Amino acid sequence: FDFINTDYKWEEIPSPHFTYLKDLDLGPCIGVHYDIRKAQEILALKRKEYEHSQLATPEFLETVELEEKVLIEWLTVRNRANLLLTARLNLLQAWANLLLVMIESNDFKSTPKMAFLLQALQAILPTLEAFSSLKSDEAFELARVAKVLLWKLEQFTVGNLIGDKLFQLFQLCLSAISQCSGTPELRSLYYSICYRYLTAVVDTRSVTNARARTLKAITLYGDRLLNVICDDAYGSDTTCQTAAMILLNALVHTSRASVDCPIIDALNRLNFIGVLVDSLKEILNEWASPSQQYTSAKLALLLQLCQTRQGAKYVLQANLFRALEQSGVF
Amino acid sequence: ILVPMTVNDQPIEKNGDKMPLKFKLGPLSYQNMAFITAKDKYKLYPVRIPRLDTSKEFSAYVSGLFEIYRDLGDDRVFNVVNSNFAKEHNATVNLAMEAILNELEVFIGRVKDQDGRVNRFYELEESLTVLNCLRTMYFILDGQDVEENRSEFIESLLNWINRSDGEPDEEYIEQVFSVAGKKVFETQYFWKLLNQLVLRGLLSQAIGCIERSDLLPYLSDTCAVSFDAVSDSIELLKQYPKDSSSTFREWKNLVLKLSQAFGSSATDISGELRDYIEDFLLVIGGNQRKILQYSRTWYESFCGFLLYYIPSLELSAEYLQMSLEANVVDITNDWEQPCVDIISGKIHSILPVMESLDSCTAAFTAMICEAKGLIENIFEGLEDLFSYRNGMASYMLNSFAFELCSLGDKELWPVAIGLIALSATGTRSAKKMVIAELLPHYPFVTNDDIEWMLSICVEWRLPEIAKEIYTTLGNIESIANFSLVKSYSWLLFEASCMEGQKVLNAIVSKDDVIIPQDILVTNSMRQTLAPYAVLSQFYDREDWGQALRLLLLLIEFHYLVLLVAKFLYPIFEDSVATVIEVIETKWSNLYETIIEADKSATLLKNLRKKLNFKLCQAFM
Amino acid sequence: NISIDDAMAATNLATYVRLHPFSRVMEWLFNEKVITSLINTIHQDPISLGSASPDSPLVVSILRAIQVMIKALELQETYLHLVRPEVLRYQGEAGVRRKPVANAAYSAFEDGILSHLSLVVDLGKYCNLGHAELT
Amino acid sequence: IYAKFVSQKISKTRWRPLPPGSLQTAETFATGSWDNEENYISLWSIGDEGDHQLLCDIRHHGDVMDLQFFDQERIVAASSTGCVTVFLHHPNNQTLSVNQQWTTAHYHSSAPCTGVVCNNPEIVTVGEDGRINLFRADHKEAVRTIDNADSSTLHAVTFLRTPEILTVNSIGQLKIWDFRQQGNEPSQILSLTGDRVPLHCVDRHPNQQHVVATGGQDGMLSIWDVRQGTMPVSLLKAHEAEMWEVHFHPSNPEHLFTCSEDGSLWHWDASSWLSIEITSLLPSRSLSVNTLDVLGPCLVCGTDAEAIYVTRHLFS
Amino acid sequence: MQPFDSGHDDLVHDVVYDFYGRHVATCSSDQHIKVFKLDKDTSNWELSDSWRAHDSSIVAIDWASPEYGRIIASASYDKTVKLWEEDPDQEECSGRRWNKLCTLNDSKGSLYSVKFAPAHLGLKLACLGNDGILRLYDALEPSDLRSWTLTSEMKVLSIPPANHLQSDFCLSWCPSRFSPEKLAVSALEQAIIYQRGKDGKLHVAAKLPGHKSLIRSISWAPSIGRWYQLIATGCKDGRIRIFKITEKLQSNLQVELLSEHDDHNGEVWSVSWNLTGTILSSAGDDGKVRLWKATYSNEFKCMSVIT
């Protein structure tokens, strides 16, 4: 696992000044394959037009010549970089598939393989930190492997290293959710990781310190983070809205354990409780099936808000009595 | 359009023998000429083409628009990464529409500030209003409804309306806040001007006009009931939704609740103020009847309808109709009807009129209208572009280019050629021909200008053009710089004559490094050889080598031969003899003159010298 | 040329395509006599090639024949696309008297060679000779 | 904007011109100093309070009275001694040398050279001897000298269209000359009547060859059109003491810059002078601002506080 | 841009722009040719040089392409055509700034017009007079601007009656660079087009029918962008005419009439074109100048009226 290296900067490219021919784009050039003749003909026509203009044609010819000699190598370097990037992507996908097949089909004990597990975690930590919001293709292969790994889980020293990385891994997830990076598929995996972390790891002085510091990370982002999660719900995707809805349950649940709560208050300001009660209408149409499990998390969340004293104020003002009557479920 | 040729000296008077007037269009738009072939009519009248823009502001405008055109890339075209190409296409195009709008606003500004004539400012603003409306209706929602993007839409709409006309101008705010014959602020005027403000989305000002007179006064005292209405109404105004079509759904709720509550309650105020408060609440609630009642112009109605009743363009057809039933289109200004047309679906047939207001704007307008796909080339057929064969937009753009070529501003020539080159239609060869004919007229002065011309001749492969341009440049130092076949030969001959008569250029042929690099032809080589020979001369065997070189040069080539003979005489083995012999074998007025100058008969002297040389060879 | 460039150079390319003998060679390649002679020349006993010298004329002739076949298989599409229609249009417009030497049934070069089964056998047997170019 | 202190009173500051077709903004400037036993011509670069690097310097004998770039590598200086010098910068080893000089360009005994302008290969100088010279690179003697051209002190000069020039003097006259002329009288004199206020600086509009701006002893800005009679087209109250330099912005001449003995540097924004808002750019505690240069978004100036002020972001 | 005096004593016949539009040549009956310069600084027109050039009234004038130097040509009633070249080594207004390079005396009748040919054909020119014979001249060796040979002679009119003061003739080459050499000629009521044949000789390739009087002016329009040609004519019958000529009794040329305009109500004396052939100008008895642009339909519309 030494082929993932960003020091070479295969994505970054030094762009020369290009005082001339700057407007000549690679439109007709483009399977990423930029043809060189499509730009050669254009620059030749432009040189001919400039020569016909009769304005310092002999002197400025060498400038156009060297600009073309630089543009051809620029195109070749871009093609080589694209090839290297796709090759690295294929290799990373193959390695991730191999690691998944190895972890899944493994009857051997886990306490001896804990060393290799920690080594893989240490190796992927910098990979995730370097590609947290750069590209949405490599994180996918590396995001799902961490998901299953978290569910398939001297002892004191190991317990500290695990909990330490699980806390660091929790930060990069909320950081991506606050910026709405990647596709809804990748954004869904992050919800499952943070879900079990806030449900199993945190849930006794050691527990208080972890719970206290955990809430600090959530408060750092504020409404910016919750706004993204609230938008994912009742969306186009079927699995993203489900994971996002269940995620909110863990946030409000762990917050009460820490008579009021800032998480529930933010949901009201973002108009989340309002639209949520509105969706209660026509619930009979929505209700193993993906639609059934989604509604379960929906009604389950509302049940939690009705347990705190402050929830009755915001929930009652939503006029939920008239919303459940139009559906005729009773 | 009738313009006075010269609002000073008019060359005619009575029908007194209708005189032969003659006119010739010049290579420069701003410099044409008229004259008369008649007795006692010997004046020349320089005329510039009616309504021509020579201003710097204009060229700035043009450059900005060309930038927008160029930057549009592949998106300046419309394809009649699957479902997104459509949405993203509209995204960028719609943005370009905003850019154009901006550039035009800036232009209009700079015209109001630096100006002799402000008529141009007015026309440009009108063009802007109509364009704002066009964007608001086709360049934001991409065929969808306001829910698709409530924020952007209402922003553009509210913008369009409050830039079309000036009213309510603050010169009218104080107009009523001054007029009396009534108790404080409570006549049809205050309210009309409050409702007007609301209908135009000008909520800030609206609020201000209230906290101006009887918010707390007459109300907080007289009727505590209506005070609460007039107050939390101003609160709702303070929070009119502009991002969520949900928040609006609930907003109109609180507003209709307020209007019902007040609707049937404690009337502890004047008979008129009662209704005067109800109407305000109705208008805010969206009562159609009322929105029409307090509207001065159709666009106030239309705007109100969209803001407070139902925010759906599916009703625009109806809205406009009601609006026009209330207030007819005001033919005072040129923008209202076009806006009505936009709103009501018939976008087209505006290009000719805009072309009358300003050729440039019209050109790019047609262009972006083609980009959106609002107009397309129906033609389906003659080896060239400037026709109806291609688009209506292509046509207008190409036309603009050609018009720019006669403007004589070298800053815009790149815009002209670029416009032609990027024309989404027409063979590369057709464009080649067009550029081949335009370029020679480029008003080059600098070195850079010329280099630009050349670069375009290269880029398009116009060697015959470049050759011509250069020919124009060629027409002692200039000759040196130039160093077609005949001319080169003449240059060679001149160099030879100079050598026979006998600095940096000569050394280069044989700052300095740059020159050597640039240099890096037969005439040149010969001159270099002559120079080397002279150098050798200045420096016995060397002298012989130089003489041999000279004889060789003479063989390759009358005056030169004479100079050589003179040199030989001044100097006065087998190879030398052979050379002398060849020269004798090879052996008019100018030559004789040169011979006379040298002496200060020739053939005889030459023969004598040859004989002497032969004798010398024999002795050796 | 005709779609973008002017119609001046078109005459040059037309004359080049009409006067160059490539069209006639391609037309002859579709004849049964040619392919029969080729497969007869390539079909030889193995003892001769084994005892022959690397510079033997038989090996050189076989190599040249294989190269001609490769060039024909490469240029058949270009010919059938940008030669036949132009030549037919020119013959229809102007007055030219030419005798056809091609078989209309053989729509491609593979139709005339798909009837020979020993060709692949001979090509495979010729791999045990050691000649790099021929192999 | 920021200041750098450089331990000498700076009389002149000029940006090095940018290479043709450069997209970069100005980063290198030259200074000349005055009022020291040892004055210097210095070249500085600005790194990307700024970081300045002294590239090289060279002793200049006499006060630096004026300074202009002739090309990328050649700098022309006018001395209080009357000497005019072309310095050559050698970028390979960051040295300055003397390329050529005219030690008797101005004289009475010594007479200060008060102004120099360049239009490669030509150089035009004026001085307190009322002499006007045309020099050409690599010619040892003046192409032309108009001896006793003016009876008043010549304070500054500009090209109109070469070989036509315009000079300003100590009694407020603009005089137009041509180096092809016979005699020692100008073709045209312009002046403001009433007080004969000395004019210290002049600049030609970059696009309109007929238009010049001048600065006076009384701090005023005058705009002149040499086709529009003998008086200025505009006379604008400005500084509280002498205006030492005036520059139209080279690429957008709706902007113009002036500096003064009173310690101010003004940015005038007419965005026309025939075809106004003014901002004062330096702090209230400044001593005489002797000189400024502007190129693109870059401004440099020099003061008697031994300070150089720079901004590379005039418009952003 | 205020009017100015030419400096001519007798009536002025023609005014012509140089290639760049910064220079102007004037010729009058006082047998003089004046050249004006457009000073950069002071946007005023100022006399560059004046001089006596003919023994009779000078009617026509024209500039040659800049790629051949500074050359002017003149036609006079003295049956001759003279060529001049500017000598930059002379003071302006000295009367010696333009040296005669040659004289063409072949014409046996007064001359009414002279036009240089498009640069892409070399120094070439044409002339027409009373003799009703068009003549083409070529400066075969571009170095010897004196070496003017006679390239061609064509009989335009066949029987010109010896008693008519009513005479008019006009010339105009096809500017087009990518079109076969050809030129238009007007002679009284007639107007015919000549085209270079494969045999290097001029042949009549068409006629522009419809003129019911004397043709005062004609000019071929620059066909930049178009595939067709357009030539306009100002007749004495008070009509401007615009003909569309396409090449697809022995011709290869088609002839359409695009427009007719009588807006002038009287004779149309001058007809001129844009540099791009985008604008067409007309002037006449009514003392007005009209500018015309082409519609999308290829009709022509008056975009302005100067007076």
CSV table of C-alpha atoms in Angstrom, one decimal, chain A residues 20-25 27-28 37 40-61 64 271 274-275 278 281, chain B residues 70 74 247 250 428 431-432 435-436 439-440 442 444 447-470:
chain,number,residue,atom,x,y,z
A,20,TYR,CA,-1.1,34.3,-26.6
A,21,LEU,CA,-3.3,31.5,-27.7
A,22,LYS,CA,-5.0,31.6,-24.3
A,23,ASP,CA,-8.4,31.7,-25.8
A,24,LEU,CA,-7.8,28.5,-27.7
A,25,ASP,CA,-9.6,25.9,-25.6
A,27,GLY,CA,-13.4,21.9,-27.0
A,28,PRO,CA,-13.1,19.9,-30.2
A,37,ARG,CA,-4.7,17.8,-34.4
A,40,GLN,CA,-3.1,22.1,-34.2
A,41,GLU,CA,-5.5,23.1,-37.0
A,42,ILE,CA,-7.0,25.9,-34.9
A,43,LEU,CA,-3.6,27.4,-34.0
A,44,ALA,CA,-2.5,27.1,-37.6
A,45,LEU,CA,-5.6,29.0,-38.8
A,46,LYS,CA,-5.0,31.6,-36.1
A,47,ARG,CA,-1.3,32.0,-37.2
A,48,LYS,CA,-2.4,32.3,-40.8
A,49,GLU,CA,-4.9,35.0,-39.8
A,50,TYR,CA,-2.3,36.9,-37.8
A,51,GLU,CA,0.2,36.7,-40.7
A,52,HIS,CA,-2.5,38.0,-43.0
A,53,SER,CA,-3.1,40.9,-40.6
A,54,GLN,CA,0.4,42.1,-41.4
A,55,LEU,CA,1.4,43.3,-37.9
A,56,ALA,CA,4.8,42.2,-36.7
A,57,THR,CA,4.4,38.7,-38.2
A,58,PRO,CA,8.1,37.7,-38.5
A,59,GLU,CA,9.1,38.6,-34.9
A,60,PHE,CA,6.1,37.2,-33.0
A,61,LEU,CA,6.3,33.9,-35.0
A,64,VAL,CA,3.6,31.1,-31.3
A,271,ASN,CA,-38.0,24.7,9.5
A,274,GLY,CA,-42.6,22.2,10.3
A,275,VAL,CA,-42.0,20.3,7.0
A,278,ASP,CA,-46.5,18.2,7.1
A,281,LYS,CA,-50.3,13.6,5.9
B,70,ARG,CA,-16.1,34.2,-25.7
B,74,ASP,CA,-19.5,25.6,-26.1
B,247,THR,CA,-42.5,30.0,4.5
B,250,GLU,CA,-47.4,30.0,6.0
B,428,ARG,CA,-13.2,27.3,-42.0
B,431,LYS,CA,-14.0,32.5,-42.8
B,432,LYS,CA,-10.5,32.3,-44.2
B,435,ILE,CA,-10.5,37.5,-42.9
B,436,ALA,CA,-8.3,37.5,-46.0
B,439,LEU,CA,-7.4,42.1,-42.3
B,440,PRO,CA,-5.6,44.4,-44.8
B,442,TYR,CA,-6.4,46.9,-39.9
B,444,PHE,CA,-1.8,49.1,-37.5
B,447,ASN,CA,5.1,46.9,-34.1
B,448,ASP,CA,2.7,44.8,-32.0
B,449,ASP,CA,-0.1,45.7,-34.2
B,450,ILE,CA,1.7,44.3,-37.2
B,451,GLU,CA,2.8,41.2,-35.3
B,452,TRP,CA,-0.9,40.7,-34.4
B,453,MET,CA,-1.8,40.9,-38.1
B,454,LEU,CA,0.9,38.4,-38.9
B,455,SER,CA,-0.1,36.1,-36.1
B,456,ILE,CA,-3.6,36.1,-37.6
B,457,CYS,CA,-2.2,35.4,-41.1
B,458,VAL,CA,-0.3,32.5,-39.5
B,459,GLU,CA,-3.3,31.2,-37.5
B,460,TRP,CA,-5.4,31.3,-40.7
B,461,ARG,CA,-2.7,30.5,-43.3
B,462,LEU,CA,-2.8,33.6,-45.4
B,463,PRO,CA,0.8,33.8,-46.8
B,464,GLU,CA,-0.4,35.9,-49.8
B,465,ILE,CA,-2.0,38.3,-47.4
B,466,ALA,CA,1.1,38.5,-45.1
B,467,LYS,CA,3.2,38.9,-48.2
B,468,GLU,CA,1.1,41.8,-49.3
B,469,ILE,CA,1.0,43.5,-45.8
B,470,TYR,CA,4.8,43.3,-45.7
